[PDB]
Design a binder for this molecule. Structure first.
Ligand code: H60
Ligand code: H60
Lengths: 303, 303
């Protein structure tokens, strides 16, 4: 029993983190086979983040402008190229610790683990969700750029996020490992801000199932609801619409608890309309939306 | 910016996890140098957990009764002994991945990372606090016994917890790595239950400082309070007394924010008396007490 925000074990990713310096800027890189991946803004000076032509800065750079350090072993850069908003630095040594891996782009509402790093050295690990507005609510200080987000299945690491910047609201923006930003964000200095966010409805329902599996039952009721009348209430409270696919995805949790999805939807509607009146669910006084149905099943396996 | 429940990178500990089987019971062991540490209840049968004489079961066991598997390599047990509630299984191979390590016992109110494991294979990592009543609120299923809790400083792993059991309330109990239980709990079948818990006051104040560092300021006020009048209110709300040492420990966070500790205490008193009236702090509608002052400083380094 018990339910926690749980990250994947970070060992396989720790072995891939290196330090990348260009000019006076140091950040983190990801060392897989003979390539080091890092944010391309490492080549920017502060005189040129208003409107950097990243191409421009890059043609003016050479291999020796990039210092790559793996622990206390310098790697020699033998090639450099740009892939969207990421740099690929070819090095003369393949990483002996390279795990089986994939580069995957995730969907809003999906979760992943972040290995926060500074100067190529891991500092901590935590779980994030990709928000509907393509930001993440992380914990990132200056120097954390190039830290990565990932999931593990079996022992293949699926990398899904590389960290690039913080927005004025204190949330974070980054790319997939092909260097394509999540959301309408750019690696140049603008007044860019997060657009309007919403609550991940299917995840809230997953977490209510987690609560029932762990013996929190006070919010349950007889009532059921129609999907249509549920989505009418969800819309009013800035919740994403619930689709039939979401209902299907919640199937296994519904079977294990014996609580039909639309039965649980009636509980959520009443929580949205009444609040909790001083009670908590799984230690929370708010409805939690950063656990996917998979997260719940994986952690709550057989109670 | 940002503040998350962050665990230590788990890589150094992942390399120490093995699988231990005795009879039909399988659980996890910790492999350091040529010793494997595991809960002694691995030698119990279900016919004998009412009143096991653990000594008895152990004299009746031989080295070959213990099957130790490290990945897919069986380790040969060449000696076995009991150390309080932990078994020490001497094996014929020293773990080549043994980190620098220490066995440390922690205090109620201190935090640590848990590497949840099943069949010697790590599943996830999360942060726990030792509750004032010496339980932990973890996430543990059958088979998780022998998973360990730890902190890292520099690159020395300080192991502080080994998991043994779940209480009827769904919280968890375990030992230090010398096999001495935290709290009044025993590795035998009783109606044992967690005693009365309290809120870790110094940690709540640390987390309020975290919030201020991250731009959450709405709960602040002019008021200051005396330590005596604060502790009168804390007592009423089941909060631990705040000592002058706690005040001193909060010194650096007070300096960085420019908010005196007793100034922040006045904010906490009003939160305790009024609630938040619909607002949140660092994404929480409850006052969070599982971040130590160190946790905050380490994560909030320079904003
Ligand atoms: C990379 O290490 C660094 C991390 C940031 C910076 C400190 C705050 N938290 C983080 O994650 N990334 C940058 O410094 C980045 C480079 C921009 C590309 C030219 N810029 C930002 O993060 C912008 C912060 C900001 C916030 C509000 C208004 C303007 C700028
Ligand atoms: C070890 O792997 C296992 C883990 C437990 C069991 C399932 C629930 N969550 C856990 O962490 N530990 C045990 O099974 C343990 C062995 C007891 C020593 C003889 N016993 C318990 O955890 C007791 C659970 C319980 C709860 C309420 C009433 C009675 C028993």
């Amino acid at each position: 029993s018990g339910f926690r925000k749980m990250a994947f074990p970070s060992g396989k990713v720790e072995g891939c983190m290196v330090q990348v310096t260009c000019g006076t800027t140091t950040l983190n890189g990801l060392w897989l086979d003979d390539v080091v991946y890092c944010p391309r803004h490492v080549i920017c000076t502060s005189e040129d983040m208003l409107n950097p032509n990243y191409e421009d800065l890059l043609i003016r750079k050479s291999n020796h402008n990039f210092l790559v350090q793996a622990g206390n072993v310098q790697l020699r850069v033998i090639g450099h190229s740009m892939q969207n908003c990421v740099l690929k630095l070819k090095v003369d040594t393949a990483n002996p610790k390279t795990p089986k891996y994939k580069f995957v782009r995730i969907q809003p509402g999906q979760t992943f683990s972040v290995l926060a790093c500074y100067n190529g050295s891991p500092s901590g690990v935590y779980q994030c969700a990709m928000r509907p507005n393509f930001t993440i609510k992380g914990s990132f200080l200056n120097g954390s750029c190039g830290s990565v987000g990932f999931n593990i299945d079996y022992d293949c690491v699926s990398f899904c996020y590389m960290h690039h910047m913080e927005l004025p609201t204190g949330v974070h923006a980054g790319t997939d490992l092909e260097g394509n930003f999540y959301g309408p964000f750019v690696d140049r200095q603008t007044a860019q801000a997060a657009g309007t966010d919403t609550t991940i409805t299917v995840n809230v329902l997953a977490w209510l199932y987690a609560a029932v599996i762990n013996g929190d039952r006070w919010f349950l009721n007889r009532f059921t609801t129609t999907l249509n009348d549920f989505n009418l209430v969800a819309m009013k409270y800035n919740y994403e619409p619930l689709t039939q696919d979401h209902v299907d995805i919640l199937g296994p949790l519904s079977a294990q608890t014996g609580i039909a999805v639309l039965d649980m939807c009636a509980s959520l509607k009443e929580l949205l309309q009444n609040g909790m009146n001083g009670r908590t669910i799984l230690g929370s006084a708010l409805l939690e939306d950063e656990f996917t149905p998979f997260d719940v099943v994986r952690q709550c396996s057989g109670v």
